[PDB]
Amino acid sequence: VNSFSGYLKLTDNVYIKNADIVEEAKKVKPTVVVNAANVYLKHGGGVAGALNKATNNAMQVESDDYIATNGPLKVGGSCVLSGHNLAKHCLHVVGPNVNKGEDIQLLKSAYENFNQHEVLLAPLLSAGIFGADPIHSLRVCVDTVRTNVYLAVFDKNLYDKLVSSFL
Ligand SMILES: O=C(O)C1(c2ccc(Cl)c(Br)c2)CC1
């Protein structure tokens, strides 16, 4: 039993809700919140910009030190950093950005990072400003993630479309 509330159950391990991931993280304080990161951990907009804003820029400060030490992530890769006031940990995951020409096949590799964590609060990878079809992202999530994932979808219209079209 966990504290996630109001989710629709899609499969044995995947759950979904129309919610602002920032507000959901502040309420649940999950062990892991997933960020929709880029390779530079520049949290400018989309989910990343919103999460970073909620940390009063502490996420960005920590991320800049991470990059200075380690260099950029790979597309499809991830790193674990602090969750600050939102979660115990933040798993920064880089899905391919279609608006940069990146290979959509890398979306499966991106979701594989979730399997290293038993339970996660997450957005749909490569959705929103990353330019992929969120219906496809949900399909890849369900077919790749085996651990327990709670998906927050900000847009109500999109949430209803994802549910109504789910096979
Ligand atoms: O939750 C949402 O509405 C969606 C999303 C996902 C990731 C990012 Cl980065 C942004 Br922006 C938006 C899925 C469309």
Layout of helices and strands:
Layout: E1 8-9, E2 14-18, H1 21-28, E3 32-36, H2 46-54, H3 58-70, E4 78-82, E5 89-93, H4 106-112, E6 119-122, H5 134-144, E7 148-153, H6 156-164
Parallel strand pairs: 2-7, 3-5, 6-7
Antiparallel strand pairs: 1-2, 4-5
Helix pairs in contact: 4-5
PDB class: viral protein
Keywords: Macrodomain, SARS-CoV-2
Assembly: monomeric
Q: Strand order, biggest sheet?
A: 1-2-7-6
Question: How many structural domains can be distinguished in the coordinates?
Answer: 1
Order of helices and strands: EEHEHHEEHEHEH
Q: Class, according to the CATH hierarchy?
A: Alpha Beta
CATH-derived topology:
Leucine Aminopeptidase, subunit E, domain 1
Largest sheet: 4 strands, mixed
- Approximate helicity band: 25-40%
Sum up the overall morphology in one term.
globular
Termini, distance in Å?
A: 26 Å
Membrane topology: Multi-pass membrane protein
Subunit structure: May form homohexamers. Interacts with N protein.
Organism: Severe acute respiratory syndrome coronavirus 2
Subcellular location: Host endoplasmic reticulum membrane
Describe this structure in words.
Residues 1-167 form the Macro domain. It is found in: Host endoplasmic reticulum membrane. The chain is an alpha/beta fold and 167 residues long. The protein has a single domain (8-163), classed as Leucine Aminopeptidase, subunit E, domain 1. 34% of the residues lie in helices and 19% in strands. The strands form two sheets. The protein has a four-stranded mixed beta sheet, with helices on both faces. Strands 3-5-4 form a three-stranded mixed beta sheet, covered by helices on one side. Helix 4 packs across helix 5. The longest helix has 13 residues, at 58-70. The chain is globular and about 45 Å long. The site of 1-(3-bromo-4-chlorophenyl)cyclopropane-1-carboxylic acid has 14 residues, from helix 2. 1-(3-bromo-4-chlorophenyl)cyclopropane-1-carboxylic acid is lined by residues 36, 46-47, 123-124, 127-130, 134, 153-155, 158.
